[PDB]
RNA sequence: GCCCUGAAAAUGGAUGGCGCUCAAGCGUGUUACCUAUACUCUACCGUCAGGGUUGAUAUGAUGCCCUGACGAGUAGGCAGG
RNA sequence: AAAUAUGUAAGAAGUCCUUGUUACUUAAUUGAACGUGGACAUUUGAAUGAAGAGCUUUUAGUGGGCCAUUUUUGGUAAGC
RNA sequence: GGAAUACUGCCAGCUGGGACUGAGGACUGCGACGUAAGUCAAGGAUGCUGGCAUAAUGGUUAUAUGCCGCCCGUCUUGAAACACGGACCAAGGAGUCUAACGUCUAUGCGAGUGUUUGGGUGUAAAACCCAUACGCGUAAUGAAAGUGAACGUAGGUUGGGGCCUCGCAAGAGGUGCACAAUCGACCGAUCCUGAUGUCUUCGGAUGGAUUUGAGUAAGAGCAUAGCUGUUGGGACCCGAAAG
């Protein structure tokens, strides 16, 4: 018979990192989680309790609840033709603050700051991110750089 | 009427509406409620939970309307008094010429406490009232007369 | 009712964009370029004709 | 050909007249589409539409529902429009004055309203007094109060209602309706 | 068979019911009989009251 | 006789006719499975913070 | 009524007179803007050469994309991108502002399209002969300047050469200008595709992919 | 590389056929030309959408009028006849 | 230790300042949640598109599939 | 050293030949050229000339000519199939009626609603009229004994069409029914709490709880009709071996 236990196919997913087995460092237990925090889910197979099912490995979601030893996390999950709402009880050992949100908050703090120093000058801001643009015209010089000119190479076995 | 019927629209298309692969055969899946616990189980749970098995006490030779006790809420109550006669009693608001309402005569069998009535005294005669219904009457200057 | 294309029929060419009248008048669909004797540096031609 | 991204020849899933055939209603429409077209006044555009509604989307507005919408601040003297039929409610006593434009009034409902020195106009009357629908208060009824809608969603743990033809114990109150009889819902 | 979200019907027609169908076509003409025979009772009952 | 056993062929086509959507979204979302004491106290912090506002209208 | 008429009319007869003077003024200005800019990059090249250097040009900010593959048997990813640039029917074409975010689009879609760097010429004639605007869906042909100004006026642009300019220069409301422009319905190339099979790359022997400043000869024959 | 040997099956036969040898064969390149229900412009039918309009004013207001887009189809659904 | 695929985020349901509620929590008017009041709308927080978005009810058929490129298992292989 | 030319690109440079089309039907628009009166190729063809009468032309038909076209029906991944039915023609020939229902729609009345068991009456199976009841609905919840819907402008928050005020606007405030989300209150079940009392074992006030109900929270329903769908029936029509 086929075999579809709970931790199937997770031989390498829940392995520890090479030369990173053993006690989980204290940092992990000192990070504080509030509701509305966006957490990254990544199981640690030494902490067997509060484990995320293998689906949620690699998935980010928001804390809806905070408890003695675990956060509750909301995950949107597609089944069939629609996302369903999913509530996960994960111990903190399997959870991490999502850096991408910190890029965002820090940018929001930037964009309020930029906006001030412009009304304090009544000038214009230009606050939206622009994407990487073409390139403007340049004049490269030949001073100390007369173009070495290359040509294709003969065939030659080295074995 | 048949003139508006779909089967009129279908004439000349083979197989009526019923298909080519799957036919319209003579009772696939069984007659009536067959296989409720089996192949017709997914529909029976959901859409009809509770369908199977017993529950509660049996009662031989039960006679409905041994339990005839229709309800009335204060929520109305004043409907029992004839319209034109009502205005009169509404303002008179007296404990001395208070109107009498024979609810059992109206066809009811228990007064229940839903809603509010105005501060006007009413003599309410009935069998059975709710602890709250008589509380409101009593607080509007009326009383409850138990009858049969 | 009928699309007319200014790339023919001057009338609708002039309906849109009046400046065409003058454009034509001053030619300048030709118009000679200026003139400059700026010659190319030695290294430019050395490399060009290089092997 | 065309890589269509949109379903071709789809119809705005919207009534466009009443399905009805009451010539007086078609007349009432003919009026309010004229109003709706030849003015601004959001009110007419809204009434026009609401004349198209099926009897289910015209639930009745009650006489107590009117009275209570009139205890709204600065509304005691507006004229309540009810593109539908106003019914009577024995449960309010003191009932205010005001003029009410509806399609129909039940017997007791134009009593109650009138007895209180109030008025019962018709929407084409209302049309005249209020071309641009001024000082009007539009009230719709409770759609979801319907009994049909009780059974919409019927599934495990949706907590909706069974379509059962007759109720009691012995009628779908056992297996699947409790922990002691297999499972619950 | 069983399907869709419908109430469970209990229509007792598994028994040759058509052998026993009573269609009151005579509802009309029996009213006339019930009259005409009340009329002619009221006669021979002299002046007595039915 | 033997028949095909399984395939997901055509299934995402089917799922993407009128499907995927997103997940439905609300401020004041469900409080399903939140710490019961906290809910209990939240209940009270709300009644209070209500109250206090009606006191500020007289 | 018999007098209130030759008020509003000669109001607008001479109010038109002005709107037209302004076009006349801008259109000339744009010429200068163009004549100079193109002279500049020439002499820029000759100077750099003269000083033993190499003026390396500014990377193109604008490309025109024609779709040349039909509508069957297209993979879901490029098919999506095809539609998000409104190229949903063979030989139809639109302009694209080049940034990394759109460049990676082109890439994705490259076997099905044929694109390159347009010219004032090609753009002028594309907008004149095959310009239709988008007004409440409806594909409306730009045959009178009023229509653009009634729709694109808020962003400046009260003429057809105001439309053109805002394209060739990209610039601030390119987005809303270009979107206004219904996708161009080109014919098939009168003259031919100039190659045996089109569904290889231009580098390999014809059509599909960036053919750069060759796109003009192509479009002009499809125009 | 091309060509030759290696290379044997049953009705009489198949680069599609004829026939072709500085090809009408193989490799490569340049142009021109032929042609789908596809693309471009226009008429007409329909469907769908947006708009105007019984303001006192003869004959359809579920109507008249203006504008844009679209059109494959089994099983099956609805609609107009 | 790739490539291709894959999660999340890119703001008004936001940011900031003031100080309200509670039985939760803190050594602690400390926190935590939810608020009052004040301030901030040109690009308000990347791109491109939008043929409108959202939503409910109900019912037909179907529930033998097959093929191609690519990835790939069994088999010497197969139009398996 | 000074030119030419090729190649490539541009012109709102000038022109010849050929083809298809000519929708619309007073005027209104944007222009153009004119010193002007006016003119125009500027929101879709006009002008001039000619041909046709047992006819020019157009429709149908037969035949020939070029190209093209396997037998339908059916089950099937696949049928023109070396799969089945069908020699030919006429008439007949297959989703019905019923009982009970789901959704939607029209209509009547509406907190009620249904005259037709029956009676009355009749121009007699019609139409017209009606007393008592009865059915469903307006109360739920428990297996049951039983108990039974307002702390509050019938609650708080958030969106919310419409309307109200300010405004010339752009906007801003006010109120916000339906509907959606969410916190709370009420009713019954469960499990705690157990006051005032009594006959000592009855009584069950009050305040509660990640429990719970097809409930409350200014009613929507009752009836007639129709399409579609559901179940029992010969149940779309034809069909066993058997009993
Ligand atoms: Mg295994
Ligand atoms: Mg593995
Ligand atoms: Mg170790
Ligand atoms: Mg354990
Ligand atoms: Mg059909
Ligand atoms: Mg069919
Ligand atoms: Mg068949
Ligand atoms: Mg099942
Ligand atoms: Mg009530
Ligand atoms: Mg309020
Ligand atoms: Mg409701
Ligand atoms: Mg109800
Ligand atoms: Mg008989
Ligand atoms: Mg088998
Ligand atoms: Mg097989
Ligand atoms: Mg299968
Ligand atoms: Mg198997
Ligand atoms: Mg061409
Ligand atoms: Mg040529
Ligand atoms: Mg040619
Ligand atoms: Mg070439
Ligand atoms: Mg042999
Ligand atoms: Mg042979
Ligand atoms: Mg070969
Ligand atoms: Mg050759
Ligand atoms: Mg060759
Ligand atoms: Mg054609
Ligand atoms: Mg079709
Ligand atoms: Mg993705
Ligand atoms: Mg966009
Ligand atoms: Mg379905
Ligand atoms: Mg189905
Ligand atoms: Mg099925
Ligand atoms: Mg089958
Ligand atoms: Mg004509
Ligand atoms: Mg003739
Ligand atoms: Mg013939
Ligand atoms: Mg042939
Ligand atoms: Mg032949
Ligand atoms: Mg077979
Ligand atoms: Mg066949
Ligand atoms: Mg064969
Ligand atoms: Mg057979
Ligand atoms: Mg024969
Ligand atoms: Mg024959
Ligand atoms: Mg016959
Ligand atoms: Mg016949
Ligand atoms: Mg009971
Ligand atoms: Mg038989
Ligand atoms: Mg027998
Ligand atoms: Mg037997």
């Amino acid at each position: 018979g086929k075999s579809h236990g709970y931790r199937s196919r997770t031989r390498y997913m829940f392995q520890r990192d090479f030369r990173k087995h053993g006690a989980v460092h204290l940092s992990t237990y000192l990070k504080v989680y509030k509701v509305g925090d966006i957490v990254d889910i990544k199981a640690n197979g030494s902490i067997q309790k509060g484990m995320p099912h293998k689906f949620y490995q690699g998935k980010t979601g928001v804390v809806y609840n905070v408890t003695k030893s675990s956060v509750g996390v909301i995950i949107n999950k597609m089944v069939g033709n629609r996302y369903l709402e999913k509530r996960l009880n994960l111990r903190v050992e399997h959870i991490k603050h999502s850096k991408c949100r910190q890029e965002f908050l820090e940018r929001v703090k930037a964009n309020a700051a930029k906006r001030a120093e412009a009304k304090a000058q009544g000038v214009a801001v230009q606050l939206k991110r622009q994407p990487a643009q073409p390139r403007e015209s340049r004049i490269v010089s030949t001073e100390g750089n007369v173009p070495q000119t290359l040509a294709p190479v003969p065939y030659e076995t080295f074995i | 009427p048949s003139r508006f019927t779909k089967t009129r629209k279908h004439r000349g298309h083979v197989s009526a509406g019923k298909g080519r692969i799957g036919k319209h055969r003579k009772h696939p899946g069984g007659r009536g409620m067959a296989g409720g616990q089996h192949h017709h189980r997914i529909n029976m749970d959901k859409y009809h939970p509770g369908y199977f098995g017993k529950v509660g006490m049996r009662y031989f030779h039960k006679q409905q309307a041994h339990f005839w006790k229709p309800v009335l809420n204060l929520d109305k109550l004043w409907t029992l008094i004839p319209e034109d006669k009502r205005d009169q009693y509404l303002k008179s608001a007296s404990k001395e010429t208070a109107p009498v309402i024979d609810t059992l005569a109206a066809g009811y069998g228990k007064i229940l406490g839903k809603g509010r009535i105005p501060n006007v005294p009413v003599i309410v005669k009935a069998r059975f009232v709710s602890k709250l219904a008589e509380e409101k009457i009593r607080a509007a200057g009326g009383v409850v007369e138990l009858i049969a | 009712v009928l699309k007319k294309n200014p790339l023919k029929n001057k009338q609708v060419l002039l309906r849109l964009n009046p400046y065409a009248k003058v454009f034509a008048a001053e030619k300048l669909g030709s118009k000679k370029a200026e003139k400059t004797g700026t010659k190319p540096a030695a290294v430019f031609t050395e490399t060009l004709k290089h092997d | 050909g065309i890589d269509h991204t949109s379903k071709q020849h789809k119809r705005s899933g919207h009534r466009t007249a009443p399905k009805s055939d009451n010539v007086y209603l078609k007349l009432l429409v003919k009026l309010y589409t004229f109003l709706a077209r030849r003015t601004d006044a959001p009110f007419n555009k809204v009434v026009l539409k609401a004349l198209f509604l099926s009897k289910i989307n015209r639930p009745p507005v009650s006489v107590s529902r009117i009275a209570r919408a009139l205890k709204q601040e600065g509304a005691a003297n507006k004229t309540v429009v009810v593109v539908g039929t106003v019914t009577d409610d024995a449960r309010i006593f003191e009932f205010p004055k005001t003029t009410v434009a509806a399609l129909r009034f039940t017997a007791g409902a134009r009593a109650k309203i009138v007895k209180a020195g109030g008025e019962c106009i018709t929407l084409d009357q209302l049309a005249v007094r209020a071309p641009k629908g001024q000082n009007t208060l539009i009230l719709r009824g409770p759609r979801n109060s319907r009994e049909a809608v009780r059974h919409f969603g019927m599934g495990p743990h949706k907590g909706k209602a069974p379509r059962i033809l007759s109720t009691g114990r012995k009628f779908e109150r056992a297996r699947g309706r409790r922990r002691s009889k297999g499972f619950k819902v | 068979a069983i399907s869709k979200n419908l109430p469970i019907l209990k229509n007792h027609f598994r028994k040759h019911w058509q052998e026993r169908v009573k269609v009151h076509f005579d509802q009309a003409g029996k009213k006339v009989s019930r009259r005409n025979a009340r009329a002619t009772r009221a006669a021979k009952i002299a002046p007595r009251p039915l | 006789a033997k028949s095909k056993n399984h395939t997901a062929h055509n299934q995402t086509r089917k799922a993407h006719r009128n499907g995927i959507k997103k997940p439905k979204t609300y401020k004041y979302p469900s409080l399903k499975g939140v710490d019961p004491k906290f809910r209990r106290n939240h209940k009270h912090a709300l009644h209070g913070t209500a109250k206090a506002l009606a006191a500020a209208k007289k | 009524t018999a007098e209130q008429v030759a008020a509003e009319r000669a109001a607008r007869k001479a109010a038109n007179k002005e709107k037209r003077a302004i076009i006349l003024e801008r259109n000339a200005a744009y010429q200068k803007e163009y004549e100079t800019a193109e002279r500049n990059i020439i002499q820029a090249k000759r100077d750099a050469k003269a000083a033993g250097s190499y003026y390396v040009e500014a990377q193109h900010k604008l490309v025109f994309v024609v779709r040349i593959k039909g509508i069957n048997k297209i993979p879901p990813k490029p098919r999506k991108v095809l539609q998000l640039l409104r190229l949903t029917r063979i030989n139809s074409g639109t302009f694209v502002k080049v940034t990394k975010a759109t460049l990676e689009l082109l890439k994705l879609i490259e076997p099905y399209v044929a694109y390159g760097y347009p010219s004032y010429s090609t753009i002028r004639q594309l907008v004149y002969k095959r310009g239709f605007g988008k007004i409440n869906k409806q594909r409306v042909p730009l045959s009178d300047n009023a229509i653009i100004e009634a729709n694109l006026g808020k962003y400046g642009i009260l003429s057809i050469d105001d439309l053109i300019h805002e394209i060739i220069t990209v610039g601030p409301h390119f987005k809303q200008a270009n979107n206004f422009l219904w996708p161009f319905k080109l014919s098939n190339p009168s003259g031919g595709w100039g190659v045996p099979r089109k569904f290889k790359h231009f580098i390999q022997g014809g059509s599909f992919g960036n053919r750069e400043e060759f796109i003009n000869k192509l479009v002009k024959s499809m125009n």
Side-chain angles (χ1 to χ4, degrees):
Chain A
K2 308 278 273 216
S3 187
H4 301 285
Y6 199 95
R7 291 185 61 181
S8 122
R9 311 180 180 134
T10 55
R11 181 222 251 251
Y12 304 115
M13 211 166 76
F14 295 171
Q15 276 184 11
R16 334 254 320 103
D17 285 21
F18 183 69
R19 269 157 46 200
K20 295 158 171 299
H21 290 225
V24 356
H25 59 192
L26 252 282
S27 290
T28 289
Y29 297 100
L30 285 200
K31 308 191 89 87
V32 175
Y33 292 105
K34 290 191 287 226
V35 131
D37 294 12
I38 305 188
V39 292
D40 288 308
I41 308 179
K42 180 177 111 53
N44 184 316
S46 64
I47 319 288
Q48 285 85 61
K49 286 195 146 151
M51 233 164 163
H53 174 270
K54 85 201 184 190
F55 176 94
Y56 304 97
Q57 173 89 341
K59 267 103 188 216
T60 311
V62 171
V63 181
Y64 81 99
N65 195 14
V66 160
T67 216
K68 182 173 116 300
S69 66
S70 357
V71 277
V73 192
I74 311 181
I75 292 295
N76 285 310
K77 127 125 109 147
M78 168 189 79
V79 7
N81 62 300
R82 118 210 92 147
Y83 286 98
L84 285 180
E85 227 202 31
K86 282 289 179 202
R87 313 267 239 233
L88 271 40
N89 304 341
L90 313 181
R91 292 195 108 93
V92 286
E93 273 111 324
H94 319 287
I95 267 302
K96 159 192 290 271
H97 278 126
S98 186
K99 221 186 171 210
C100 66
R101 153 117 316 215
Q102 256 312 324
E103 93 86 2
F104 174 52
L105 300 161
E106 286 185 1
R107 190 168 49 91
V108 187
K109 280 220 199 310
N111 268 341
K114 298 186 173 226
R115 205 203 298 287
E117 246 274 356
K119 202 179 201 178
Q121 286 159 41
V123 202
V125 241
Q126 211 231 306
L127 288 163
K128 332 237 257 216
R129 274 132 63 238
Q130 242 43 23
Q133 311 255 313
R135 247 181 266 154
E136 303 290 344
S137 93
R138 330 120 112 64
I139 322 163
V140 351
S141 178
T142 218
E143 200 177 331
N145 215 339
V146 170
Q148 212 208 302
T149 127
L150 317 180
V153 256
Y155 183 73
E156 184 177 14
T157 74
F158 303 126
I159 202 49
Chain B
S2 88
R3 153 189 35 145
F4 305 146
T5 224
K6 246 320 177 306
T7 115
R8 298 311 316 178
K9 246 47 199 299
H10 273 140
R11 308 252 96 145
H13 298 44
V14 218
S15 73
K18 317 300 169 197
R20 309 182 104 109
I21 314 91
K23 312 314 189 179
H24 176 175
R25 296 240 143 116
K26 233 117 172 14
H27 306 273
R31 273 153 188 269
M33 290 262 113
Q37 262 178 326
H38 298 299
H39 66 269
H40 280 144
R41 145 106 109 113
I42 290 196
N43 180 278
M44 274 289 92
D45 307 23
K46 151 186 211 176
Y47 302 157
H48 291 97
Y51 187 83
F52 288 110
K54 305 163 156 163
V55 65
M57 244 178 319
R58 265 187 307 167
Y59 194 157
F60 311 130
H61 182 55
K62 175 171 187 194
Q63 298 188 298
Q64 260 51 254
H66 264 203
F67 323 95
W68 181 79
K69 191 210 287 194
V71 297
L72 193 283
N73 290 294
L74 303 184
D75 194 52
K76 315 289 268 212
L77 209 242
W78 278 87
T79 39
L80 293 207
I81 288 319
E83 173 135 70
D84 32 73
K85 311 195 179 182
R86 238 175 272 164
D87 270 33
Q88 311 189 319
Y89 293 110
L90 264 1
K91 191 53 166 171
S92 167
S94 82
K95 284 200 163 196
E96 43 256 309
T97 21
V100 189
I101 310 185
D102 191 320
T103 76
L104 183 57
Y108 297 88
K110 181 153 170 178
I111 288 301
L112 300 180
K114 170 173 171 174
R116 315 178 146 172
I117 54 174
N119 213 126
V120 161
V122 202
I123 290 199
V124 195
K125 301 195 299 178
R127 9 169 119 146
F128 313 111
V129 291
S130 62
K131 205 249 195 186
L132 188 262
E134 96 149 302
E135 274 199 345
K136 288 196 179 187
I137 303 166
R138 285 248 267 207
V143 297
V144 163
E145 272 160 44
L146 307 194
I147 51 173
Chain C
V1 305
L2 215 213
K3 185 139 153 58
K4 309 215 168 162
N5 152 37
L7 306 188
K8 27 217 173 170
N9 185 226
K10 285 206 55 178
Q11 282 309 299
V12 56
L13 167 59
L14 280 171
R15 177 208 296 160
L16 280 22
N17 175 21
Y19 173 74
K21 186 175 122 201
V22 21
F23 185 103
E26 327 206 328
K27 308 308 227 56
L28 60 64
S30 305
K31 170 165 174 89
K32 301 187 65 171
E34 237 288 51
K35 221 42 223 194
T36 21
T38 82
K39 303 204 160 182
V43 67
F44 171 86
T45 27
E46 264 160 353
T47 47
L48 193 270
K49 282 125 88 185
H50 185 258
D51 302 339
Chain D
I2 336 290
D3 195 357
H4 294 280
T5 59
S6 353
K7 169 169 295 181
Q8 293 314 116
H9 313 110
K10 177 186 188 273
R11 11 205 177 83
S12 55
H14 295 148
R15 271 194 171 178
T16 224
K19 194 178 187 48
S20 209
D21 250 303
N22 177 337
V23 299
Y24 303 105
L25 213 193
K26 296 181 237 149
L27 276 184
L28 287 168
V29 164
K30 197 191 120 175
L31 190 262
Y32 259 102
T33 136
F34 174 83
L35 280 165
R37 206 177 95 251
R38 296 279 264 143
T39 51
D40 317 295
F43 174 77
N44 303 322
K45 261 96 161 184
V46 181
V47 173
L48 198 219
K49 290 191 188 294
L51 280 174
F52 294 171
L53 288 202
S54 36
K55 172 183 169 172
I56 246 149
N57 324 98
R58 293 179 276 100
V61 165
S62 148
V63 125
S64 68
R65 181 169 214 103
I66 281 187
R68 213 229 282 288
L70 278 174
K71 319 180 52 162
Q72 295 184 23
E73 234 225 317
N77 263 286
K78 302 195 158 188
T79 135
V80 31
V81 181
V82 166
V83 202
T85 92
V86 183
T87 60
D88 185 31
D89 195 17
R91 302 171 305 200
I92 11 82
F93 297 83
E94 320 200 58
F95 179 94
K97 199 194 180 164
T98 68
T99 86
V100 182
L103 296 166
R104 309 170 210 264
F105 289 83
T106 62
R110 75 180 335 126
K112 257 249 157 50
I113 290 183
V114 158
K115 169 169 167 191
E119 194 175 2
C120 286
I121 49 189
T122 55
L123 289 183
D124 69 308
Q125 278 159 19
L126 181 285
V128 183
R129 310 191 184 179
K132 298 214 196 77
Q134 33 269 128
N135 199 43
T136 37
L137 215 235
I138 325 198
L139 303 184
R140 305 113 117 189
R143 288 178 165 164
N144 284 7
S145 281
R146 213 155 101 247
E147 202 278 342
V149 316
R150 291 208 307 133
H151 315 279
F152 296 168
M154 184 49 171
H157 305 110
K158 284 289 179 58
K160 263 54 173 36
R163 301 173 167 158
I164 182 45
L165 266 242
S166 55
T167 91
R169 69 118 210 171
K170 281 170 46 87
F171 304 93
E172 319 185 19
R173 249 153 202 285
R175 205 201 74 116
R177 287 324 299 219
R178 60 187 60 228
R179 259 63 171 161
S180 74
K181 284 299 175 54
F183 58 100
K184 190 192 168 300
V185 166
Chain E
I2 308 180
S3 57
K4 315 183 189 75
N5 187 9
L6 311 170
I8 293 178
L9 302 160
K10 289 183 70 173
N11 293 5
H12 295 46
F13 297 102
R14 295 160 199 253
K15 200 144 90 168
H16 284 139
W17 54 287
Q18 293 173 35
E19 291 192 359
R20 301 175 301 280
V21 185
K22 211 167 284 172
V23 186
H24 303 303
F25 283 141
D26 42 31
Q27 182 189 24
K30 283 163 79 74
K31 188 188 194 173
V32 176
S33 284
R34 248 183 288 96
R35 275 168 85 73
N36 298 4
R38 247 192 310 266
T40 69
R41 179 163 194 270
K44 62 165 287 177
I45 306 309
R48 295 182 287 164
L50 282 196
Chain F
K2 311 223 290 186
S3 47
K4 182 152 187 85
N5 314 269
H6 161 83
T7 181
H9 201 239
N10 195 34
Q11 301 313 298
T12 64
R13 186 220 90 83
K14 277 169 70 186
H16 280 215
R17 279 324 293 272
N18 7 84
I20 287 353
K21 320 109 187 317
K22 238 316 177 182
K24 310 186 153 205
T25 242
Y26 311 102
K27 207 63 161 176
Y28 317 116
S30 165
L31 290 188
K32 151 215 274 310
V34 173
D35 184 19
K37 77 116 112 79
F38 169 80
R39 292 212 45 180
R40 232 175 298 110
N41 180 74
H42 196 251
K43 192 224 281 186
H44 300 148
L46 289 170
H47 175 295
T49 199
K51 191 142 155 64
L53 265 169
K57 312 255 82 283
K58 272 74 50 43
Chain G
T1 14
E3 223 299 279
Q4 81 179 124
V5 277
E8 189 215 337
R9 190 169 197 268
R12 69 149 159 75
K13 271 301 176 189
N16 287 1
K17 200 74 182 177
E18 158 133 354
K19 260 165 191 160
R20 210 146 204 286
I22 298 176
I23 285 163
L24 186 270
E25 204 182 64
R26 298 191 176 178
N27 276 8
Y30 294 133
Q31 169 90 1
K32 194 156 184 184
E33 213 235 275
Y34 295 163
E35 180 179 299
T36 59
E38 187 211 43
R39 262 297 132 193
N40 289 139
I41 316 187
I42 287 178
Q43 197 78 40
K45 284 178 175 165
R46 297 149 156 191
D47 290 337
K49 269 197 275 157
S53 295
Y54 292 117
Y55 180 102
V56 19
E57 216 194 332
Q59 292 198 294
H60 289 91
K61 311 162 90 179
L62 215 226
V63 298
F64 188 71
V65 178
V66 188
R67 121 118 91 152
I68 62 186
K69 172 64 170 184
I71 60 150
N72 322 85
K73 297 162 138 79
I74 302 312
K77 178 97 96 169
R79 204 242 234 195
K80 223 314 171 200
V81 172
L82 258 174
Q83 304 151 350
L84 296 167
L85 318 168
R86 311 183 291 160
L87 310 175
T88 40
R89 137 197 253 124
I90 190 159
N91 294 301
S92 87
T94 75
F95 291 99
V96 183
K97 182 204 182 197
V98 189
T99 54
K100 213 286 160 51
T102 61
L103 199 281
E104 278 319 310
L105 289 195
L106 289 204
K107 283 202 180 186
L108 256 177
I109 224 189
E110 193 174 78
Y112 316 96
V113 304
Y115 70 83
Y117 315 126
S119 66
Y120 180 74
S121 194
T122 313
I123 307 184
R124 170 175 202 273
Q125 316 193 5
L126 252 174
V127 190
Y128 276 17
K129 194 193 162 173
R130 296 199 130 81
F132 291 63
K134 193 166 74 137
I135 348 275
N136 318 101
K137 194 273 266 74
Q138 324 249 314
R139 182 187 175 253
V140 178
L142 328 156
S143 52
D144 203 303
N145 276 306
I147 294 128
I148 318 182
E149 175 175 22
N151 285 280
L152 235 52
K154 74 232 256 177
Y155 320 108
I157 307 175
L158 33 281
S159 65
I160 196 166
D161 299 77
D162 265 348
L163 230 201
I164 293 182
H165 176 261
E166 194 68 3
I167 298 303
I168 183 160
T169 54
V170 190
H173 313 76
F174 175 95
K175 211 221 193 193
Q176 299 87 13
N178 187 72
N179 180 292
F180 176 61
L181 269 196
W182 195 280
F184 296 80
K185 291 184 169 261
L186 313 186
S187 163
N188 256 297
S190 171
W193 296 84
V195 286
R197 305 170 50 78
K198 352 195 305 210
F199 301 140
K200 305 181 194 161
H201 197 292
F202 185 80
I203 304 191
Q204 294 236 128
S207 322
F208 135 14
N210 199 333
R211 64 174 63 203
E212 310 190 0
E213 355 219 345
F214 279 136
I215 194 60
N216 292 284
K217 145 160 279 189
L218 215 239
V219 174
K220 285 207 172 158
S221 42
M222 304 178 53
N223 193 30

